[PDB]
Amino acid sequence: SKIPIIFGLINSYQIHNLLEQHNAKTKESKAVFLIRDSSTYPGLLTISYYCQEQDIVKHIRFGLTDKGWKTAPKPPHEPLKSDSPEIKEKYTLDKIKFERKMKQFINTAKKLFEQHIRAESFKTLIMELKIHEFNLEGLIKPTRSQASQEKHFTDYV
């Protein structure tokens, strides 16, 4: 009857309110966090938390590698209509780099995500959370109706 610790596809309003309900804004950054299915890249996990320094919710994507869960490539900063030609020229190169790196990353991650759950992938998720200095006691756990239904997470309990 155990519920996975991974959220399913939840919306941005719900993410903010879950963090606020668990008092993320009166605790250090990463003291409170949640883990959810990525809404952009199936097979990836996204860690959402509150960044005290910027007063915003931030997100970090993880995917399976041969070594276990690792951080995915991160995208360059979004275009701003105030951008100069220099910013936009750099963005072109950085976006191509991101897309190439993310395409390779997802192709490997999806294959591993699809493969049989010998379950020892779960330990590597905890390791990467520790390396990122997420307070594991601050993990927000989903309710049954909000938990991920991905078969890979059935024993992520």
Residue numbers in the entry: 11 to 167
Authors' own words:
To understand the molecular basis underlying the superbinding characteristics of the Legionella SH2 domains, we determined the structures of L. longbeachae LeSH and the L. pneumophila RavO SH2 domain in complex with tyrosine-phosphorylated peptides by X-ray crystallography. Compared to the Src SH2 domain, LeSH is missing two β-strands (βA and βF) but contains a 45-residue insert between the strand βE and the helix αB. This extra sequence in LeSH contains a structural motif called the pancreatic polypeptide (PP)-fold, comprising an amphipathic α-helix (named herein as αEF) packed against a polyproline segment via favorable hydrophobic contacts. Indeed, the SH2 and PP folds together form a clamp-like structure that grasp the pTyr residue.
We obtained crystal structures of LeSH in complex with three different pTyr ligands, including the phosphotyrosine itself, a 13-mer peptide derived from the pTyr381 site of DnaJ-A1, and another 13-mer peptide corresponding to the pTyr387 site in IL2Rβ. Apart from the pTyr residue, which assumed the same conformation in all three complexes, we were not able to detect the electron density for residues preceding the pTyr in the DnaJ-A1 peptide or any residues flanking the pTyr in the IL2Rβ peptide despite the high resolution (1.6–1.7 Å) of the complex structures obtained. This suggests that, in contrary to their important role in binding to a mammalian SH2 domain, residues C-terminal to the pTyr may not make a significant contribution in binding to a Legionella SH2 domain. Of note, the positive charge on LeSH extends well beyond the pTyr-binding pocket due to the presence of a Lys-rich face in the αEF helix. The expansive positive electrostatic potential explains the general (i.e., position-independent) preference for acidic residues by LeSH beyond the pTyr. However, the R46K mutant of LeSH bound the DnaJ-A1 and IL2βR peptides that contain multiple Asp/Glu residues markedly better than to the remaining peptides that contain fewer acidic residues. This indicates that charge–charge interaction plays a pivotal role in the LeSH-peptide ligand interaction.
